């Protein structure tokens, strides 16, 4: 305790910029076009790194993340589409794995999802899912635990979702980075915990809702990841 | 100058791994790194994964440790344009995600924010690459070469791939993730790759029985690169 770094991971300006404003003594490297920000969120150790939109930012964001700051434990937060029928916008999703919608190398027996060298999913940190449980109850907040789905694209009904939800029934939730950074975490070994805020449920209107309530997401998903570090630094 | 080269496979690799002297392996993040020389020439040469996160995660870390010069990408490919046959060579002008979709957002298919929908390769490295080409009399094409988390094997995959981009000359799985990488590092890059297959219904029979063939060709390519840069 007390020696702990939570490396959090946002790809967009709007959540990020709440974390940023509240961590105390920050400073900002800029690398790779990636700018990270360290500093104590309400006394724990952070490195927070606002990462590009899609995989390969995403990767290049949390390779360097762990690279330079070498942070114990990685949170990826921001907005996604919600699939899961009981969410609404605004309520949380935690991953309990992760796995790329697109990627697909079946012509050579791998699951779809997978990629060669890689297990067919990324899972998430018990501890670290737990905790975000535990933050969940504590806020009295409305979530679902389990897949969420990453790729390329925006979500936005028509076949983009209908192929996710046939091939992935069970997903909660789809966005464009946690997969990526599971996939990287995974390969240094560290681990790591997705905890988005619903901004969209994915369909014709998921980019007027994404433009009307992505404020919302970031207002609860940075609320969720300012409790999660606390509760991981303390109880 | 230091070369960096990334390839995905092992067979790709391997046959470059083989030739490096005064060689060192450094490995991270799930990457295998050699450095030495290449025929006299400064070289780190990287085997990612499969795949734009691992191509991804890989160009970061060979640029952020051994700071390269310029990249090259290389190995094998899917041609999409007529005049490629098994073998030869295809050299990017420019890298684009085949499977990239904000459109709705208003960014042009392919391209992701806070990035230009494509990414151009340098000038010099093609030059370079199309000398050795013509002096090794070589089939090859320079253009857009497309990258997507799939592999593509005709069907809808390659109808949307020829929707999308008409031009394109090669698909594959790596390229733009490096370009991308190099891009937001300022690093200029270029890849030379050899074709495994057409990118049909049939490019994973061909894939498998030519991947012997594009890996050497393509491993020719970059040696005779580096020492053209050098
Ligand atoms: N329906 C949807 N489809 C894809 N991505 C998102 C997102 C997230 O918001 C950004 C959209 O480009 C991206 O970071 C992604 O992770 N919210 N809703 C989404
Ligand atoms: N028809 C095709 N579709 C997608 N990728 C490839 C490739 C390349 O070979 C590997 C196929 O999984 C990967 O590294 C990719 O970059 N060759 N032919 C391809």
Redesign the interface.
């Known amino acids: 305790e007390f020696s702990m770094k939570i490396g959090i991971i946002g790809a967009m300006e709007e959540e990020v910029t709440l974390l940023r404003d509240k961590i105390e003594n920050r400073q900002t490297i800029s690398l790779?076009?990636?700018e990270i920000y360290t500093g104590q969120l309400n006394g724990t150790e952070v490195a927070l790194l606002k990462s590009?939109?899609?995989?390969?930012?995403?990767?290049?964001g949390?390779?360097?993340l762990?690279?330079h700051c070498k942070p114990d434990v990685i949170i990826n937060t921001g907005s996604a589409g919600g699939l899961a029928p009981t969410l609404k916008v605004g309520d949380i999703v935690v991953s309990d794995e992760a796995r790329?919608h697109?990627?697909?190398?079946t012509?050579?027996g791998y699951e779809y999802g997978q990629?060669?060298?890689?297990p067919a999913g990324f899972k998430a940190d018990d501890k670290l899912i737990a905790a975000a449980e535990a933050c969940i109850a504590e806020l009295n907040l409305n979530a679902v635990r389990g897949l969420i789905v990453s790729?390329?694209?925006?979500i936005?009904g028509s076949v983009?979702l209908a192929k996710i939800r046939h091939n992935f029934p069970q997903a909660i939730a789809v966005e464009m980075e946690a997969?990526?950074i599971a996939?990287?975490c995974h390969?240094?070994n560290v681990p790591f915990v997705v905890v988005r805020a619903i901004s969209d449920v994915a369909d014709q209107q998921?980019?007027l809702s994404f433009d009307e309530f992505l404020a919302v997401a970031a207002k609860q998903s940075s609320l969720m990841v300012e409790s999660l570090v606390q509760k991981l630094a303390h109880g």
């Open positions: 790779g076009g990636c590009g939109i899609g995989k390969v930012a995403a990767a290049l949390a390779t360097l762990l690279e790329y697109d990627a697909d190398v012509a050579f990629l060669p060298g890689c790729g390329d694209a925006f936005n983009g997969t990526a996939h990287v390969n240094f998921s980019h």
